[PDB]
Amino acid sequence: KTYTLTDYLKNTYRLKLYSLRWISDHEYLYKQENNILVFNAEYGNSSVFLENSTFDEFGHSINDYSISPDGQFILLEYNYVKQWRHSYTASYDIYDLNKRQLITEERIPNNTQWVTWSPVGHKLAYVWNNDIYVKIEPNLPSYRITWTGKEDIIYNGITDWVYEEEVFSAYSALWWSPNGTFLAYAQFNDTEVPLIEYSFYSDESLQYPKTVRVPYPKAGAVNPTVKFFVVNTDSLSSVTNATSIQITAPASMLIGDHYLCDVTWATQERISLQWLRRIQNYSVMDICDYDESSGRWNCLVARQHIEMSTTGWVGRFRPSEPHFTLDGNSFYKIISNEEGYRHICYFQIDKKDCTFITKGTWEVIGIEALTSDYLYYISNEYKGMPGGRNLYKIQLSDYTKVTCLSCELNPERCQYYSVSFSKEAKYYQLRCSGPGLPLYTLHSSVNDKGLRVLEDNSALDKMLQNVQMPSKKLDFIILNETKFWYQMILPPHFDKSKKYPLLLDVYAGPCSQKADTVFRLNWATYLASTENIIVASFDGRGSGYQGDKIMHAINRRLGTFEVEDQIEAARQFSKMGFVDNKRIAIWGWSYGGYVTSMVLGSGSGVFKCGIAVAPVSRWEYYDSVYTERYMGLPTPEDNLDHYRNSTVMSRAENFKQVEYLLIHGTADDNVHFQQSAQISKALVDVGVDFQAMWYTDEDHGIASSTAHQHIYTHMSHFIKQCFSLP
Amino acid sequence: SRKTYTLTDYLKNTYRLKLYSLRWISDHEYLYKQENNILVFNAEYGNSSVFLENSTFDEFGHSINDYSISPDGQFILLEYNYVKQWRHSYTASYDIYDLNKRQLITEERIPNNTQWVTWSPVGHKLAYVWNNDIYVKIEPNLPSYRITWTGKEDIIYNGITDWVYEEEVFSAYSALWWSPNGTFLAYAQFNDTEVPLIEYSFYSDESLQYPKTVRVPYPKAGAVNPTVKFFVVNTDSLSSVTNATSIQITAPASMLIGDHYLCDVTWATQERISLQWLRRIQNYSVMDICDYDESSGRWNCLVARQHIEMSTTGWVGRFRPSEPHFTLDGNSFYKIISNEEGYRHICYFQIDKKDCTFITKGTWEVIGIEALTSDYLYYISNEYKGMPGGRNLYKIQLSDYTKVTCLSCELNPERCQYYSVSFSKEAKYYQLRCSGPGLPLYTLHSSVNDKGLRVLEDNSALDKMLQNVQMPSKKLDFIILNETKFWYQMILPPHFDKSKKYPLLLDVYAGPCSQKADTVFRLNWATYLASTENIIVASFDGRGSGYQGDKIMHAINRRLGTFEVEDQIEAARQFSKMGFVDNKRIAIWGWSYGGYVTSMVLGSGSGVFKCGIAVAPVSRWEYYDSVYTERYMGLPTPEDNLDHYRNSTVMSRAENFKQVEYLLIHGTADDNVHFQQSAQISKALVDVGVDFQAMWYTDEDHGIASSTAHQHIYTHMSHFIKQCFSLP
């Protein structure tokens, strides 16, 4: 048989994972059914750290727990109420693991926006009603740390909309120091930030549609401001209002609009912060130390570091994070070479110049672990494949010595990895995503020897061997010297003679990679396996993990090359002899929906049909942080001219020659529905027919169970009909 | 080869229908635009003259979209900067032009952004509303008079209606009534302080970075309705520095007892004015004849003169209580009221006397009173040939009811069975307007000997053009159901061979007192579908439809979403029963109430229809405005009609769509039928796992009538229809 839409939708073929949480450097927690066993990394044996029963009766559905470092409590999260992409509120309850008695006194508020323990011990810090509260003991009263919170105005401890989504990629906005002595946080002011407003219809019972209003800054609009503070969580009394010490500047940032882009504690008395100018090609890092007697925090200018650019923005999406040495005196952090390839550089806190410890036409995806003799990192060097992933270790005393921890384990099924070390990189869990089926192994850092296999996904392999699964070809093509990768999901019993319809799956956003060695079971799977349709992807100009030459090829010019190279890919794929020139479609979501629109509106006759889901249409309608970063400001003095040059509706006319399907959630807080409405309006004015579909109350993810299922069913029909498939 | 009526012909309106819109400025003359310059006409002899010349307001710097002559012909109201709001309400700029001195007035100019403005029934006075306030200008060059100081956006309206009174009760933005004399200016005052607001986005032009949220005082079923007060001021006692005194006319005590509405205002004399009030439960209504009193300058309304109008079978009136037409002295008036047998006829009232006398009866209804003279009473009815879907002009002698005469029945039978009329100030002359079933014909006449003066337009140009195009024919007939006959019409293709099996599209509306079956001549989408796609387009008037008596119309009282839906599926059933229908290709479509019905029918799971299109429909009545919905469904409270309110939602029938192709369409800026309505339909469908086709229209309202939107939406439905009928 074959992999169908129902399989995809009904998740008939699930991939097993092995989610574990190190609680120490020798132990880790792992959910075994309705039990939270605790394993021993060495002998790998376990024991029920907590029985499913324990938390029995309690008229509330519990979703995800959180054991304190002390292991003396396990805050229980329930009543989860999804907000933005990371934010959400829930009710909480602590439970003493030794008194088996659920806390009752001072219990954490309801509608909590975020909680978290101290890195060690059982200190609890939480945000409520936009204010910070601190608990030294689960059963003892909380201490107000802030008194300025104000729903969607003043945010203390939690990011505002754009900061969570495009900056800290998190809701949380507070960082505990190593031993829980200091509690740091940022403060966001949205007062002058405009609000995007949309209707939310809700349950049929609702008589009047509701209006959601979110402080959301669009390109060139008034941005939110920020303040950083640090409060000593030991000087707090039942009387004094914990005095928070602020950390301002740098003056090079205060000269105007800027953002806080990173918080990284170096030591128990030293914290690092990176600042980014609205024009994101200049970043400043400050390393501040606690001044014993004085109580304030000082950031020696001798210790600040400038990370600027002249061919684009800074970082892959933001100035990378620092990974400090144990004594917080120096650090390492990915930065761009003089050659354009991001590599690990070594800094001395008060030494302006760093030394690249890695180099070459490949790049470091990130720094995973740091010990006194080794720096563990992931890169895409191996086989010279930007789309592959591996764990590497480099000797700090000799950069010439760099061993690849994963590369050879099973070169067959594992060319993409992820790592997870213990409390002191004594052991680490290797996580293979593919090209084969997920494989999780446990190793020892002192020898890197494989302790055992935690999960081989044999159960799946079994089932999958009875399904006409599709195949996957990951290779490249060349354009003007440089080579650009791409991947094709091929139908079962592929035949290079027979011509197949081709569906171009695209995202093509700045620093993206739709071509990798990861094993995925999705809609493309069904299309290929059941509709014998080739689903391809191509990472052209603007894509990441190949040096700035590629990734910055679209600086201040979104909707140019990424769009062009996209057309070229299909343009050549056809010239491959197994593609039906007359049956080539293109589809994408978000940025991918934009490029998909720009392309179907290019008029290259190359495509027959295309689908754009939750697409951007005019960069001025998208948030600042993300947009300006590639486009600058929509001012005539800056880039307003190109901003206006890249709109989807400017190419409405050219839609007459293609078959278009536009879809969009009405509650999209990210890429506003307004975008897609502005598009349809353009097609109506020009006289271009096309199909549409809006999804009531769904956001950017159009992920609700029924919503998700419906859109894939619809898009199917669209595609199968466009390709004349039974 | 011979062509057909294509989509492009209807969209690009290639075959145009000549009109002839007069504008009686007197009982002897009328204004007519020479499509470049308006001129004056003499009804008597037919000779004309260039009243206002195109080459006059040039270099104006702006364009005029509507002129407006004064009652004394001494001034001409110029209108520019027009900006549409709702169905009738709009705003614009104005200028006064002296026709007696050919000079645009430059003093005390009418404000910019004016909401409404009308002359005086006589002379040349002016009453305009700016910023929700009423102002008066005795002379154009002179300053105005602030009649009100309570005006305020979305809260207090003085002289203009708020969204619901505009669309549902009055069907006009205006809320001021001059006294036939001109000395009196009566006006209404609406209060929406607590009326919930319907909010929705308006994206505006691409350059709008952040979408704008439109907030509107709109009461949904059972919500907090607006309140209202009445006033009458003396435009003679104005001339001052002091504030205008505004007398108020309250009660009736039978109306103040609870929520209610002001539904009609008609002056009777210079010192008499009649007001008709409606209760929130629109089945009871009072008529208050109020007489002026010079003694106290106040207005009184002797309860001894009220006329109650209630209905135990439904609501009062077709859509609201009918208007009264008063006699000379104003002690008597004629009006439409359904008689004890259920039909609407003309009843004679003498105020002081009880009950009224019907001067008309029969198994047909009086559509409307057009003119009242001391001599006769002219009206429109569907008496002729017992065709409910026919319309003719009659005249009944007031001194002997047996002397009824049809003024339009025989004029041109085979060609005209549907007429509308337009009289002069005292109806010395009138223009009949034959809009069916043949080519639109326009005729002018004299009341005296009812002579046929002449022809103003007989579309002989279109007629010639339609002689090289395969036009479809129209079949108007009926069928019996439950021993009753219900009419239906079909747009049959060219050479309609009863042998073949044609695909049929059921065009529906079926709203309360609606009528989709008539003798009217039309050139629309159906024309194209039948002519080019050879599709049979039919409509059917079932229970709840109008112009056939209350037994039928009130059939759906307190039961919207029942019989009218049923009778629809049935009609279809009965059509494929005639043999020239392909059971495999039966579709259905409707706009507004038509979408609702089209949705409910596709949701009844009868499987009779393959596909269906629903344009901006209603999904559940609690979503519609009170005035309308309530008049049929009552109150949505457990204590009244809530249950059925919950039973008639399209949403609850989602699962049954699994067996159909549905095309859902709505303008995102609809203020009438909130987009929210289709937003819920689409959501319930998605939750039951039903695939369907949707299409939203950015910034379009209930009409989806822009030039680009109109063509786009129709092109689209034509694609869906054909697709559904498997035909090129």
Ligand SMILES: *[C@H](N)[C@@H]1CCCN1C(=O)[C@@H](N)Cc1ccc(-c2ccccc2)cc1
């Ligand atoms: C489509 N997916 C759209 C196209 C415009 C950008 N899109 C988004 O949805 C971005 N907000 C996606 C995004 C969000 C966050 C990060 C990020 C990266 C690194 C650190 C923190 C956050 C990247 C991309």
Ligand SMILES: *[C@H](N)[C@@H]1CCCN1C(=O)[C@H](N)Cc1ccc(-c2ccccc2)cc1
């Ligand atoms: C669709 N066409 C929808 C159907 C629900 C009501 N809709 C409207 O557009 C209007 N609210 C209908 C309407 C009908 C008739 C009148 C009217 C008022 C006064 C006298 C006669 C008719 C007003 C509004």
